[PDB]
Amino acid sequence: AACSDRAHGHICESFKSFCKDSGRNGVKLRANCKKTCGLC
């Protein structure tokens, strides 16, 4: 499982500070943006 961004692109950045969200928004961020969130 490689690490990178799969989201549309503007989703990770627009929600970069949301990567630490305990809600669905956060989970989807770490998934669609395993990189922008930092999971490598």
Q: How far apart are CA 1 and CA 16, in angstroms?
A: 21
What total of structural domains would you count in the chain?
1
Report how far apart, in Å, the C-alpha atoms of 10 and of each of 1, 30 are. Answer: 22, 14
Note whether 19 and 31 are within 8 A (CB): no
Report how far apart, in Å, the C-alpha atoms of 9 and of each of 14, 15, 24, 26 are. Answer: 9, 10, 18, 15
CATH number of the domain to which 35 belongs? 1.10.10.1870
The pair of structure tokens assigned to 16 is: 């970069």
Experimentally determined by: NMR
- Note down the domain range covering 6: 1-40
